[PDB]
Amino acid sequence: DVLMTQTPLSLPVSLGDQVSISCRSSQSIFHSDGKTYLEWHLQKPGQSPKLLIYKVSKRFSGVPDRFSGSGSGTDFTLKISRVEAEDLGVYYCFQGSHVPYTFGGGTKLEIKRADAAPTVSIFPPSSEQLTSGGASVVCFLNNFYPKDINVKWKIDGSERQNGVLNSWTDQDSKDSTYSMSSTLTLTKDEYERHNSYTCEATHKTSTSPIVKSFNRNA
Amino acid sequence: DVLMTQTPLSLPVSLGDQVSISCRSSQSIFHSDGKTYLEWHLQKPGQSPKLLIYKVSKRFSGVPDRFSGSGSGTDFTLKISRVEAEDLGVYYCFQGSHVPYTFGGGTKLEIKRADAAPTVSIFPPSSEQLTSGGASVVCFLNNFYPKDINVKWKIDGSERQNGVLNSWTDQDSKDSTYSMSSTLTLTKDEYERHNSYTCEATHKTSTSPIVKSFNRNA
Amino acid sequence: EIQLQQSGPELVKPGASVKVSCKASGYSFIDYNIHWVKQSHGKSLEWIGYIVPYSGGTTFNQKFKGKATLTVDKSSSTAFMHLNSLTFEDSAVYYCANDYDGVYWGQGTTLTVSSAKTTPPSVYPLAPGSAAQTNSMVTLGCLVKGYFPEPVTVTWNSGSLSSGVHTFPAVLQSDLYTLSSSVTVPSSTWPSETVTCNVAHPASSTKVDKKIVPR
Amino acid sequence: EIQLQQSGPELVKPGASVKVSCKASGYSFIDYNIHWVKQSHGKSLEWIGYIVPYSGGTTFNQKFKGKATLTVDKSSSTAFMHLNSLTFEDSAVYYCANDYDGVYWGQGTTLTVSSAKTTPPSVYPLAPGSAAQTNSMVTLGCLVKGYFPEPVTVTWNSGSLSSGVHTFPAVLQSDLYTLSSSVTVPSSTWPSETVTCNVAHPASSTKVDKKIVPRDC
Numbered sequence: 001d002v003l004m005t006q007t008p009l010s011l012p013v014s015l016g017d018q019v020s021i022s023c024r025s026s027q028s029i030f031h032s033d034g035k036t037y038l039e040w041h042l043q044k045p046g047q048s049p050k051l052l053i054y055k056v057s058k059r060f061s062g063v064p065d066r067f068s069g070s071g072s073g074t075d076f077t078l079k080i081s082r083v084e085a086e087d088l089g090v091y092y093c094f095q096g097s098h099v100p101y102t103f104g105g106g107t108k109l110e111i112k113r114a115d116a117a118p119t120v121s122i123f124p125p126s127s128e129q130l131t132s133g134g135a136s137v138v139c140f141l142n143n144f145y146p147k148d149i150n151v152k153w154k155i156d157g158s159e160r161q162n163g164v165l166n167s168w169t170d171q172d173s174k175d176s177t178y179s180m181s182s183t184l185t186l187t188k189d190e191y192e193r194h195n196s197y198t199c200e201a202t203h204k205t206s207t208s209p210i211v212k213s214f215n216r217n218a
Numbered sequence: 219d220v221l222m223t224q225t226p227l228s229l230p231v232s233l234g235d236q237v238s239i240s241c242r243s244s245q246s247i248f249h250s251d252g253k254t255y256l257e258w259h260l261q262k263p264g265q266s267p268k269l270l271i272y273k274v275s276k277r278f279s280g281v282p283d284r285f286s287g288s289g290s291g292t293d294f295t296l297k298i299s300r301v302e303a304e305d306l307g308v309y310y311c312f313q314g315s316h317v318p319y320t321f322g323g324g325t326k327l328e329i330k331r332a333d334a335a336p337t338v339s340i341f342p343p344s345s346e347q348l349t350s351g352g353a354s355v356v357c358f359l360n361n362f363y364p365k366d367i368n369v370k371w372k373i374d375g376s377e378r379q380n381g382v383l384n385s386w387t388d389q390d391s392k393d394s395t396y397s398m399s400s401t402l403t404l405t406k407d408e409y410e411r412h413n414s415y416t417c418e419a420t421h422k423t424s425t426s427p428i429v430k431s432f433n434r435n436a
Numbered sequence: 437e438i439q440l441q442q443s444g445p446e447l448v449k450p451g452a453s454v455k456v457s458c459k460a461s462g463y464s465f466i467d468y469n470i471h472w473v474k475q476s477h478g479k480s481l482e483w484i485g486y487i488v489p490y491s492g493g494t495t496f497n498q499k500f501k502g503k504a505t506l507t508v509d510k511s512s513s514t515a516f517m518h519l520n521s522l523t524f525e526d527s528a529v530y531y532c533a534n535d536y537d538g539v540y541w542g543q544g545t546t547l548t549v550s551s552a553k554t555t556p557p558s559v560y561p562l563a564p565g566s567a568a569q570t571n572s573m574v575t576l577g578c579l580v581k582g583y584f585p586e587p588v589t590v591t592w593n594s595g596s597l598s599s600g601v602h603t604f605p606a607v608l609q610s611d612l613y614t615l616s617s618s619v620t621v622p623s624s625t626w627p628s629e630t631v632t633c634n635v636a637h638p639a640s641s642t643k644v645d646k647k648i649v650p651r
Numbered sequence: 652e653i654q655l656q657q658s659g660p661e662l663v664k665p666g667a668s669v670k671v672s673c674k675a676s677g678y679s680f681i682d683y684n685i686h687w688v689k690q691s692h693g694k695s696l697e698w699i700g701y702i703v704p705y706s707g708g709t710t711f712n713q714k715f716k717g718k719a720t721l722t723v724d725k726s727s728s729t730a731f732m733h734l735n736s737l738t739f740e741d742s743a744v745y746y747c748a749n750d751y752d753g754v755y756w757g758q759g760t761t762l763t764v765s766s767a768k769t770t771p772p773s774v775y776p777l778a779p780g781s782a783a784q785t786n787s788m789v790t791l792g793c794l795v796k797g798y799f800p801e802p803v804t805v806t807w808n809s810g811s812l813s814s815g816v817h818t819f820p821a822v823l824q825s826d827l828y829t830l831s832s833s834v835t836v837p838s839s840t841w842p843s844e845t846v847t848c849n850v851a852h853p854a855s856s857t858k859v860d861k862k863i864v865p866r867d868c
């Protein structure tokens with residue numbers, strides 16, 4: 001199978017700047033009819049993909065002239081002359097020359113902004129949940145940038161990796177930050193066998209760990 | 219340096235009373251995080267301090283509801299709605315918003331009891347001490363209340379301040395009174411140069427000074 | 437205008453089969469190829485194969501040979517994709533697309549394969565516990581746990597509180613979904629005023645309100 | 652449960668240095684700061700500074716720069732404070748404390764700096780000048796002067812006389828300790844019956860008995 005390799009995986013950009021994305025194939029995607037079947041699609045969250053460019057450099061109907069495609073053989077490039085807000089999303093290259101047709105892994109464009117430390121909040125299990133034999137400890141790590149962050153749960157000083165469920169939001173349209181939710185689910189009994197609960201975050205914005213904790217009795 | 223001032227210095231209370239202690243800073247104690255890092259700690263004799271309240275009004279884990287904290291800017295107040303035996307001790311406020319962090323001088327909570335007149339006893343130097351070339355004249359002022367007392371030593375009618383060492387007991391666990399020992403140290407020769415030795419005390423329980431005295435040649 | 441309209445979301449049990457429709461309009465359907473694509477985990481795109489409407493001829497990605505069956509109904513300008521012997525790995529979003537003057541995409545069809553039964557969520561208000569900073573802003577939360585199937589709608593104060601809200605994508609745990617939502621408000625607002633998280637789960641005809649109460 | 656356990660009391664000579672340890676348990680040590688505090692004469696509290704375990708970074712009260720050195724051993728969850736070039740003014744109780752969800756305090760470490768050598772006490776009987784007023788209740792005493800180091804134990808009549816006893820905290824005079832003890836008994840018991848103060852000073856294995864006899868002297 002022809003492998004399509006896109007670089008970079010994610011690209012922080014500034015509105016109005018010029019950006020270029022790369023797509024390389026493991027072998028030539030030249031077709032016997034003299035044409036090269038390389039396409040570029042754009043997919044925004046929650047929507048279906050939309051074709052931008054086909055046959056390497058042909059612009060699909062309605063696509064702005066700021067989008068341009070070039071390349072030949074195994075190296076292809078998509079260029080956006082002046083990036084706009086509506087251009088943000090995931091870009092995928094596709095080859096339709098050799099069966100099975102394949103897609104690249106995608107390149108995600110996000111807005112670049114200043115770093116921001118997460119605002120961390122920790123919540124002990126609600127009274128109502130405990131009465132059912134369950135205990136979920138929740139930690140919110142809100143409005144931070146960049147997206148790279150490591151969250152660890154420490155119970156009585158010991159790291160707990162089992163029972164942890166994480167979820168992240170997409171880049172916020174208003175402040176360009178990211179948010180994350182981390183939930184530690186235990187049994188009512190397990191929860192009562194310990195006292196110290198810590199949600200620890202490691203982020204570029206702080207030398208030492210960013211933490212929030214609580215004790216089971218207060 | 220932000221100076222912390224606590225008033226009063228000592229507060230006599232009866233079990234069950236509702237009291238309020240004051241702590242003031244020479245300057246505002248607002249920190250960058252938008253917070254006010256003010257703490258109240260309680261220290262019992264022979265023990266390490268214990269946190270009661272932090273961030274002006276947050277109760278520390280395991281601290282009974284009878285403790286309440288409030289204040290703002292430069293004036294803070296610790297309130298105990300119902301004094302219990304476990305609440306007797308020295309209360310310290312602390313500011314952790316401006317380096318170097320500082321503590322107040324402390325407010326001592328003591329048990330209030332009925333007035334008690336001191337039993338004063340004066341003792342001339344023992345023959346054993348004189349043989350070694352020393353002469354300590356001792357005055358005990360026992361089982362009195364309140365604690366406020368002023369003791370003066372007079373040699374041949376003249377007040378003597380140098381060479382005097384005082385030591386106090388803490389409030390008695392049984393009768394709630396205080397006791398004190400005052401020692402006047404001289405050399406054998408100096409003790410031999412004078413004749414009249416007096417230990418004089420002024421206390422709430424007597425309209426005139428309480429005096430105990432002895433003459434060397436008797 | 438050219439449009440490819442796909443059938444709605446499907447919830448099916450493992451081992452069964454399902455048919456996804458792709459209705460075409462605005463052009464000569466019989467003359468252009470219809471392709472099918474699978475998108476797993478909202479990321480990886482995989483080409484399944486295509487069908488030539490006139491001949492019924494098909495070309496597949498070997499990986500999907502047997503799993504998918506492609507057909508077309510010339511009379512109604514509709515292409516169909518049958519997925520057989522469904523497994524959990526078949527859960528994904530499927531798209532049809534054509535090769536007309538470039539490429540037009542269908543809106544996608546979400547397929548969820550599971551043995552789980554419709555289950556209402558347990559809604560738990562999350563209020564700050566033992567010390568959560570006596571200052572400026574306060575973050576409150578709402579935990580929506582153990583529901584099936586998606587989706588649930590979470591609002592704060594019936595939609596009045598929109599700013600400062602973060603609702604996180606649901607995660608699958610023990611065959612059921614769980615999601616959380618946080619709201620940050622001035623501490624002069626709470627607990628002085630009431631803050632409520634409203635949760636609606638259409639599948640179970642559930643509508644729950646949970647006030648966020650102190651301690 | 653969260654605990655901060657400090658090392659034991661120390662008696663050191665001026666000019667030397669000492670290391671006070673503070674072992675943490677019950678939470679992730681690397682996540683919170685360790686502060687050090689000094690308490691002189693069981694009254695005034697002074698903040699020395701703190702250390703950030705992860706980075707080793709420190710913030711000090713300018714008054715303690717050079718005097719104290721703060722370090723940490725991540726593997727053993729222990730913080731250390733080194734007091735250097737000791738002088739008499741360094742004698743105090745030192746506490747470590749953290750900033751975990753409020754403040755947890757260590758039990759404290761008492762440091763005594765002195766160049767004094769072990770010296771047994773001189774015990775002197777304190778009898779009222781011939782007789783203090785005469786009858787009802789009479790107060791007798793025992794002066795324990797010039798010993799080092801603390802402590803001394805003072806009992807009356809081998810512990811038989813327990814009520815009416817006041818033993819005062821030792822005071823430092825000329826680099827040595829001095830303390831006094833008083834006992835009050837019915838005038839109908841002394842001088843008829845004997846009253847003796849028993850003094851023991853463990854450090855010097857000294858044990859002395861001094862019976863209180865009338866006449867001041």
Ligand SMILES: Nc1ccc(CNC2=[NH+]CCCC2)cc1
Nearest residue numbers: 037094096097471533534535539
């Ligand atoms: N040789 C060729 C291959 C594929 C196509 C259609 N391109 C597609 N884009 C992405 C998936 C849907 C089909 C046209 C010509």
Ligand SMILES: Nc1ccc(CNC2=[NH+]CCCC2)cc1
Nearest residue numbers: 255312314315686688748750754
């Ligand atoms: N900004 C801040 C300053 C100090 C502290 C810890 N408070 C302490 N209480 C008294 C001495 C030990 C440390 C926490 C935060």
